[PDB]
Write a protein that binds this ligand. Structure first.
Ligand SMILES: CCCCCCCCCCCCCCCCCC(=O)OC[C@H](COP(=O)([O-])OCC(O)COP(=O)([O-])OC[C@@H](COC(=O)CCCCCCCCCCCCCCCCC)OC(=O)CCCCCCCCCCCCCCCCC)OC(=O)CCCCCCCCCCCCCCCCC
Ligand SMILES: CCCCCCCCCCCCCCCCCC(=O)OC[C@H](COP(=O)([O-])OCC[N+](C)(C)C)OC(=O)CCCCCCCCCCCCCCCCC
Ligand SMILES: CCCCCCCCCCCCCCCCCC(=O)OC[C@H](COP(=O)(O)OCCN)OC(=O)CCCCCCCCCCCCCCCCC
Ligand SMILES: CCCCCCCCCCC[C@H](O)CC(=O)SCCNC(=O)CCNC(=O)[C@H](O)C(C)(C)COP(=O)(O)O
Ligand code: SF4
Ligand code: SF4
Ligand code: SF4
Ligand code: FES
Ligand SMILES: [Zn+2]
Lengths: 95, 112, 385, 114, 118, 83, 263, 178, 198
């Protein structure tokens, strides 16, 4: 910014775009420093009641892998339902 | 009819229904040698028979593409002959046989 | 085909690549890329480190996409623990996940041009990059190599004010991409050096495990972010930029289009990020808040054990893959019940892509090889690991 | 016992392969000393080849031998298709390192743990 | 068809270890004891084989400990005594196995402490 | 010299390091700086030293100033308190 | 004969009549979180951190002190036996002074780990803590006893393994302090074992006060040469100088104990 | 949702007007001239560079920068040698050995951060209970010799004293977040 | 606690049975993790056959090879555990086929089945030492040209045995046995207390 109008007009034209509206250099639009102090929210599990960990510890309630076909009519089954075709976009199908 | 398939390398196959019917019928034939109760024969015969039946039943390729999935019809052709190749390969491999060898003991115990 | 040993000549860089080649005059007969000039041991070193002290290694594996890599380990460690991050953290990871994609594409498109010979796009977009780094710094503390995305969510909530600035930037970045375009998308010359160079068929791309824009550029529709959603990339709406006539020019256009689509995903994340916590509440997996560890005994014990010993992940193994900007980045993390991992093979979108250099650059000139290394976004950190 | 054969059914057949590799290296030593401008004597180098080929003379098992030449062949390829520059080759000669005595009295005089 | 070899798998020739550290290194296969500090026994379960300790001279510039032995920090963990012995034989390191020593059963009963005559 | 009496002997050669250079040491030594702070005369048997500044200080601990002879000293600050 | 069959989570282990519930879990391989129970020290039941749930029973039982009975199923990991640990650990920690970065039994704590493994992630003790005056019990053991979880293993060892019979409990309520009523030093051989046997870091070693921290210590198993009993010992070395010698168990020679001289 | 880039929806049949427009594009390099206009445009934009010594690129409070050891206001160094800063350092950089000071307090006889080993993760900042080791703002500590980069307790304590005022302000700004 | 859908643990489980039935000569174990991931385990001889069936079967198309890796369990007689992770863009599912290979008992190469493996197989040889028959060009990829020893083996020292410095006398870079100035401090981290039955 701080450009004489003519330079701006030359700029906008040569570029073909209103570069003034979206300048790259930042001027007094960037968040001021020393933004106010933050009081962040405490999440769940901070209840002082009905908060038993045994009821909220997925870490080791996990079990050893389930085993099928261990070494020690029927229809065909796929790894999973065949995938669904993606659909062309509607805002900008092409380009 | 279409101009080209999304996939770069694949090229539009005219007479796609005929090309599929040729490949599908071939596979069914090769499978005819597999042992009778061989798992691959029963499973793939079921899949291939359903695929043909649909190819025979549908005269519109766009709906054919919907009925057996496969995205573009050209891909289904590639998948069918790829399967035809493996069917020939497995007959040589004889994988329907029992396990080649039991794993050394404690071979599959992860906590270790 | 006089071997020229090109690439120790810093000609396409992206790291240090000795692309031994045999060239009959200016035609390339065979390219045998050499690797490991940047092997550093990242996979063995991790076995001797705890889960949280191995997180910084992932940022270094492919450091142009600093964070997106961290998300892959995060996800992997979360799966093994069967813990999930809190809702705000998920959006953050998608917010910085995308910002990181832009950062990678600005790197890939502009560095591609510098090797081609166009130098002004790099300076134009490195200024935008710079501005993004600052987001990283004001969120993590480091310009790059943040360590912000940890195995149980983010480390610390966003500063009070970042979202607003990740808006001003996003509101404008588009024009910056537009400019590059007016310089390269239709240049009468960019097209020539890029069009019909390194065409890869669709069947061949899947066969050589390309798994990235390289597949998407050939017209195969696969974005692990839409096919197998991770985090909250499911709750956003974006369009994968599929390509046809896959070649250096087409894929490029795809990378410029994901820069565009990522701005669509970033916008949403700013518009819909929830109030909440940024780390799991299980002191078992996530370190306790410093006010809590300084006033509550259970929190100190959990702080002491977590930092000194570790998560103690339950025994198991998982392969979790995300859609890192380069392509599918996956960590196969085998884990004994111990706090330190047992194996952590990093699948690098790039080990597969380089391999394809041979099957892509055939009957091509020396300049063509330079263009193709660019269209694979090879960061030797991920390939060498 | 009851092992599967890697490439050589018996030490006999395996030894055949070792002979071939020796020849290969023997024929190559001179070229390397010239294409790498190494400051060594062809004769000297050829003895080194012998050294290595015998350092592993004790192996009796056929499978171990077969891998040894696979690996050996790979090294040759790196030295005839030159991807290994002098620094790499000369390392074989251990030129800079100071040799350590194996005499007990010698070790006693120098290292806590021999 | 399989071929027969009575030769103890020794693969010392393929492992790629310097000669000095294969003939002068004694490794001990032992089940780790429990630091008496803690009463948990989850670290006294798997056998470990550990290479013999070597020089740790002080560094002149900073006083940090410095070691010239590469196989020092390496302790491999093996689930059973038989498997660990096998690793030593094929890698060619000397071994001296120590039998696991588990606490003997001890009879305890709260009543005893209130015994008429103890 | 340093906090811990680290003084290279008159014959040690690491002193060559200090030749033509400054051996970095700090005049402000803690052992002494804590002493200056006076004993806090609290009027409760057990008082707590949060470390000053709460979250910006050290883990909170309670000290028993019951012993009449001696004074409680926070294992963290070193601050002393007497009843 | 003399082999009852008790089920630990339906594993039908068989134990001599007399085995405690904690002992039954051990042979299956499960380990009841425990404080105040040491194999070679009398069962006291002070902590009640080992409460388990025998099947079809109204209340949970004390593992270390309950003679097992035929048929019982232990349900060690039952939702109940976890509330019975998530709620005890709440109490031990409530009066505990959080100076874990002072407590040199940092990584050698059977109370953080049993808290990180069997207890909760937070605290609800918004009230104030307690503090107990320290004691100069001797020149070897530093008793920062505000750490004590009143587990009475010292008072046992000091009476049962060693015949000192000096250490004792004094008072009732939450100011039961387990220290010598009059300040008489605990002077006896076998003295330093108290350090190793107190799971809390209340009383620890004064020479090895703050020289190290256990994760760093490389542990080499060797033999006592100071005396002819040849007691087994583990020499804990950091960066090449010995930092501590603590006992390692040999059933026949030193069963978990070592002399004051050889440590 | 997908999007075709570089896919021509249809075959526009050449119309003279179209052909001319195209031929003119090849003959008179029309698009090439378009590209020149863009660069001429920026030539007129204000350059974004900063006088490096005189002006400095902005770094917010969490910037990790250079290690320092803080001291209590009284003057007692904060570190109490719990040594978990050593435990969680990913690079093995921090070496700590301690012994009870004469006062009887716990303190570190030797605290050595090897900055060349350090990868400035900032976990040490995180891990410290007394928050004695902090990531200080300064990033300009380039040194002529490798030894200078290795830092003992006296350099870090001195680094702490020099930058304590800003370190205190930075921790003041970001502690609520942590 | 992560959200788990049992739809997948059922779909994948069934497929596992399907694969097993179709390839019973090689499939030894087929398990689905609690994380909804299938992991057919095959005898080493079934490398070629099991992969090919997955790459070219209409009901199981697994076109791309995500990764080929080899964990090393030293205790296990067959030290290495080659693991191949595959993706099916058609059915949006991944499977892992893992085999076992000892140091001197080579595995077949699948470069034929997937050419992606051309590089990863060279990576497994360089790091772990497993050998792959019928490989087009197996040669060290990541390690130095003259490196001796396979690095990711659990029995290889982290720091290694050789390090490089420039020597003036010989005016050329020169290996020397590793001498480290601060050895890797080997913190013992395992706690003596278990977490759950698992
Ligand atoms: C040559 C003829 C003058 C050219 C000229 O005046 O250009 C600036 C003048 C304003 O351009 P701008 O991009 O708006 O300037 C940025 C600020 O507005 C104006 O910038 P500012 O806000 O910094 O204004 C202060 C500036 C003001 O300086 C000027 O604007 C005059 C510069 C004269 C250069 C000659 O003075 C300075 O900062 C110190 C530098 C002065 C000139 C240094 C180079 C002198 C070279 C002498 C030998 C040639 O150009 C025009 O008026 C239109 C020129 C169209 C050309 C086609
Ligand atoms: C004052 C500085 C003026 C700078 C002008 C060039 C930069 C600005 C360009 C702005 C822009 O984007 O428009 C370009 C525009 C953009 O057009 P376009 O490429 O988007 O498409 C328009 C043309 N059709 C539709 C037919 C395809 O390009 C043109 O208008 C055509 C330029 C033809 C140039 C022919 C070669 C140069 C002239 C050679 C003859 C000599 C001329 C005089 C030489 C000097 C004599 C002293
Ligand atoms: C009577 C009828 C007269 C008709 C006249 C037609 C224009 C005269 C000049 C035509 C030059 C030939 C031409 O058509 O362009 C060649 C080339 C573009 O070729 P291309 O589009 O790639 O087509 C390849 C087909 N095989 O063109 C190029 O690619 C040139 C390479 C780029 C070099 C820089 C181009 C931009 C230069 C901008 C400044 C130009 C200033 C010219 C005047 C300067 C002052 C004299
Ligand atoms: C000048 C550059 C020096 C480079 C030298 C060269 O490249 C390095 C090299 O020798 S590459 C490894 C060679 N090593 C083998 O090829 C295995 C040999 N195998 C045996 O020796 C068996 O024990 C056998 C039974 C054959 C004994 O029989 P015999 O004594 O050979 O006859
Ligand atoms: S005992 Fe020492 S270490 Fe164990 S918890 Fe209490 S304070 Fe922390
Ligand atoms: S001192 Fe140690 S042992 Fe004696 S009671 Fe307190 S805690 Fe239990
Ligand atoms: S953590 Fe903070 S206090 Fe504990 S040692 Fe490291 S620096 Fe000193
Ligand atoms: S161990 Fe059961 S009562 Fe303390
Ligand atoms: Zn204090």
């Amino acid at each position: 910014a701080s450009a004489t109008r003519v330079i701006q007009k030359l700029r906008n034209w040569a570029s073909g775009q209103d570069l003034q509206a979206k300048l790259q250099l930042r001027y007094q639009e960037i968040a001021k420093r020393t933004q106010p102090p933050p009081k962040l929210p405490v999440g769940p599990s901070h209840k002082l009641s009905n908060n038993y960990y045994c009821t909220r510890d997925g870490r080791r309630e996990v079990v050893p892998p389930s085993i099928i076909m261990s070494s020690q009519e029927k229809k065909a089954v796929t790894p999973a339902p065949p995938m669904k075709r993606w659909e062309l976009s509607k805002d900008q199908p092409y380009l | 009819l279409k101009k080209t398939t999304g996939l770069v390398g694949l090229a539009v196959c005219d007479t796609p229904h005929e090309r599929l019917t040729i490949l599908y019928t071939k596979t069914l034939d090769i499978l005819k040698h597999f042992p009778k109760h061989a798992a691959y024969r029963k499973y793939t015969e079921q899949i291939t028979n359903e695929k043909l039946d649909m190819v025979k039943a549908e005269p519109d390729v766009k709906k054919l593409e919907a009925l057996l999935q496969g995205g573009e019809v050209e891909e289904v052709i590639l998948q069918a002959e790829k399967e035809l190749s493996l069917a020939r390969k497995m007959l040589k491999w004889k994988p329907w046989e029992p396990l080649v060898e039991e794993p050394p003991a404690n071979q599959w115990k992860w906590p270790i | 085909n006089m071997t020229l040993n090109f690439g120790p000549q810093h000609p396409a860089a992206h790291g240090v690549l000795r692309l031994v080649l045999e060239l009959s005059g200016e035609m390339v007969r065979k390219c045998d890329p050499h690797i490991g000039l940047l092997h550093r041991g990242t996979e063995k070193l991790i076995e001797y480190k705890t889960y949280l002290q191995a997180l910084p290694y992932f940022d270094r594996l492919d450091y142009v996409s600093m964070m997106c890599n961290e998300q892959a380990y995060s996800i992997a460690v979360e799966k093994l623990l069967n813990i999930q991050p809190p809702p705000r953290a998920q959006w953050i990871r998608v917010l910085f996940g995308e910002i990181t994609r832009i950062l990678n594409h600005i790197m890939a498109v502009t560095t591609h041009a510098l090797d081609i010979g166009a130098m002004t796009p790099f300076f134009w977009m490195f200024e935008e990059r710079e501005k993004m780094f600052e987001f990283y710094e004001r969120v993590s503390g480091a310009r790059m190599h943040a360590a912000y995305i940890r195995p149980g969510g983010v480390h610390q909530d966003l500063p009070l004010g970042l979202l607003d600035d990740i808006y001003e930037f996003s509101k404008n970045f588009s024009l910056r991409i537009d400019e590059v375009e007016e310089m390269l998308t239709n240049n009468r010359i960019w097209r020539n050096r890029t069009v019909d160079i390194g065409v890869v068929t669709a069947e061949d791309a899947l066969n050589y495990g390309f798994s990235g824009v390289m597949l998407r550029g050939s017209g195969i529709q696969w974005d692990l972010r839409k096919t197998q959603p991770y985090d909250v990339y499911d709750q956003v709406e974006f369009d994968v930029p599929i390509g046809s006539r896959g070649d250096c020019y087409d894929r490029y256009l795809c990378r410029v289009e994901e820069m565009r689509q990522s701005l669509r995903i970033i916008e949403q994340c700013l518009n819909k990020m929830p109030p909440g916590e940024i780390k799991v509440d299980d002191a078992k997996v996530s370190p306790p808040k410093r006010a809590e560890m300084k006033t509550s005994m259970e929190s100190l014990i959990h702080h002491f054990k977590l930092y000194t010993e570790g998560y103690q992940v339950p025994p198991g193994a998982t392969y979790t893959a995300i859609e890192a900007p380069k392509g599918e980045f996956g960590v196969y993390l085998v884990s004994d019940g111990s706090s330190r991992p047992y194996r952590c093979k990093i699948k690098a979108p790039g080990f597969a892509h380089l391999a394809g250099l041979d099957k892509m650059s055939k009957g091509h000139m020396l300049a063509d090889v330079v263009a193709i290394i660019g269209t694979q976004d090879i960061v030797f950190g991920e390939i060498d690991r | 016992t009851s092992v599967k054969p890697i490439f050589s059914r018996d030490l006999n057949e395996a030894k055949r392969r070792v002979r071939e590799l020796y020849r290969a290296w023997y024929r190559e030593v001179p070229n390397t000393v010239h294409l790498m401008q190494l400051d060594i004597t062809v004769k000297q180098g050829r003895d080194k080849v012998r050294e290595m080929f015998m350092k592993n003379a004790h192996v009796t098992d056929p499978r171990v031998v077969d891998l040894l030449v696979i690996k050996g062949k790979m090294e040759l390829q790196e030295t005839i298709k030159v991807w290994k520059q002098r620094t790499h080759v000369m390392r074989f000669f251990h030129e800079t390192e100071t040799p350590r005595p194996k005499d007990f009295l010698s070790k006693f005089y120098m290292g806590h743990d021999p | 068809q399989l071929i027969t070899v009575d030769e103890k798998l020794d693969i010392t020739t393929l492992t790629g270890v310097p000669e000095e550290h294969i003939k002068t290194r004694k490794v001990r296969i032992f089940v780790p004891a429990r630091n008496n500090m803690q009463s948990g026994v989850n670290n006294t379960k798997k056998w470990k084989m550990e290479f013999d300790t070597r020089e740790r001279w002080e560094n002149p510039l900073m006083g940090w400990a410095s070691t010239a032995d590469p196989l020092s920090n390496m302790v491999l963990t093996f689930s059973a005594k038989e498997d660990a012995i096998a690793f030593a034989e094929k890698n060619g390191w000397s071994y001296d196995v120590e039998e696991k020593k588990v606490p003997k059963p001890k009879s305890k009963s709260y009543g005893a402490n209130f015994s008429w005559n103890k | 010299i340093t906090h811990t009496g680290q003084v290279y002997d008159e014959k040690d050669y690491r002193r060559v390091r200090f030749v033509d250079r400054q051996k970095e040491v700090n005049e402000n030594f803690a052992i002494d700086l804590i002493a200056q702070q006076p004993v806090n005369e609290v009027e409760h048997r057990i008082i707590a030293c949060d470390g000053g500044g709460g979250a910006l200080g050290h883990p909170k601990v309670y000290i028993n100033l019951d012993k009449e002879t001696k004074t409680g000293t926070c294992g963290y600050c070193g601050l002393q308190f007497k009843q | 004969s003399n082999l009852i069959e008790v089920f630990v989570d339906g594993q039908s282990v068989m134990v001599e009549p007399g085995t405690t519930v904690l002992q039954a879990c051990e042979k299956v391989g499960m380990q009841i979180p425990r404080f105040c129970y040491h194999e070679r020290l009398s069962v006291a039941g002070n902590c009640r951190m080992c409460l388990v749930e025998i099947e079809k029973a109204p209340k949970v039982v004390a593992a270390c002190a309950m003679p097992v009975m035929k048929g019982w199923n232990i349900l060690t990991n039952s939702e109940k036996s976890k509330k019975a640990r998530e709620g005890v650990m709440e109490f031990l920690l409530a009066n505990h002074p959080l100076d874990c970065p002072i407590c040199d039994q940092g990584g050698e704590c059977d109370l953080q780990d049993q808290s990180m493994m069997f207890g909760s992630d937070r605290s609800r003790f918004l009230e104030g803590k307690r503090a107990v005056e320290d004691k100069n019990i001797g020149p070897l053991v530093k008793t920062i006893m505000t750490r004590c979880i009143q587990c009475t293993r010292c008072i046992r060892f000091a009476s049962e393994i060693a015949g000192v019979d000096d250490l004792g409990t004094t008072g009732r309520g939450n100011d039961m302090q387990v220290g010598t009523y009059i300040e008489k030093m605990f002077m006896s051989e076998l003295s330093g074992n108290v350090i190793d046997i107190c799971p809390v870091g209340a009383l620890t070693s004064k020479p090895y006060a703050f020289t190290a921290r256990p994760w760093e210590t490389r542990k080499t198993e060797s033999i006592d040469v100071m005396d002819a009993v040849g007691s087994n010992i583990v020499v804990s070395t950091r960066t090449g100088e010995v930092m501590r010698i603590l006992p390692r168990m040999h059933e026949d020679i030193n069963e978990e104990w070592i002399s004051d001289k050889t440590r | 949702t997908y999007k075709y880039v570089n896919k021509k929806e249809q075959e526009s049949e050449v119309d003279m007007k179209s052909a001319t427009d195209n031929a003119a594009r090849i003959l008179m390099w029309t698009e090439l001239i378009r590209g020149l206009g863009m660069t001429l445009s920026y030539l007129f934009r204000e350059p974004a560079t900063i006088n490096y010594p005189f002006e400095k690129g902005p770094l917010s409070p969490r910037f990790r920068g250079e290690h320092a050891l803080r001291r209590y206001p009284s003057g007692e160094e904060r570190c109490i040698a719990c040594k978990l800063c050593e435990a969680i350092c990913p690079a093995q950089a921090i070496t700590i050995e301690a012994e009870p000071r004469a006062d009887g307090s716990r303190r570190t006889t030797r605290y050595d951060i090897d900055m060349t080993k350090c990868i400035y993760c900032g976990f040490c900042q995180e891990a410290c209970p007394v928050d004695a080791i902090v990531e200080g703002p300064n990033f300009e500590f380039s040194t002529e010799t490798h030894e200078e980069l290795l830092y003992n307790k006296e350099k870090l304590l001195n680094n702490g004293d020099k930058w304590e005022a800003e370190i205190a302000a930075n921790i003041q700004a970001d502690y609520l977040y942590r | 606690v992560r959200p788990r859908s049992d739809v997948t643990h059922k779909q994948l489980s069934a497929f596992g049975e399907y694969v097993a039935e179709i390839l019973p000569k090689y499939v030894q174990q087929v398990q689905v993790s609690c994380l909804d991931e299938l992991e057919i385990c095959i005898h080493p001889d079934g490398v070629i056959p099991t992969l090919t069936f997955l790459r070219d079967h209409t009901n199981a198309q697994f076109k791309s090879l995500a990764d080929l890796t080899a964990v090393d369990v030293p205790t296990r007689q067959n030290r290495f555990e080659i693991v191949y992770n595959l993706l099916s863009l058609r059915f949006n599912s991944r499977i892992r086929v893992k085999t076992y290979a000892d140091e001197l008992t080579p595995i077949d190469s699948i470069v034929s089945v997937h050419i992606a493996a051309n590089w990863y197989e060279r990576e497994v040889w360089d790091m772990f030492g497993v050998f792959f028959f019928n490989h087009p060009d197996l040669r060290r990829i990541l390690t130095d040209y003259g490196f001796e020893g396979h690095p990711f083996r659990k029995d290889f020292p982290l720091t290694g045995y050789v390090e490089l410095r420039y020597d003036d006398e010989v005016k050329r870079v020169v290996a020397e046995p590793v001498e480290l100035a601060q050895e890797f401090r080997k913190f013992d981290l395992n706690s003596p207390w278990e977490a759950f039955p698992a």
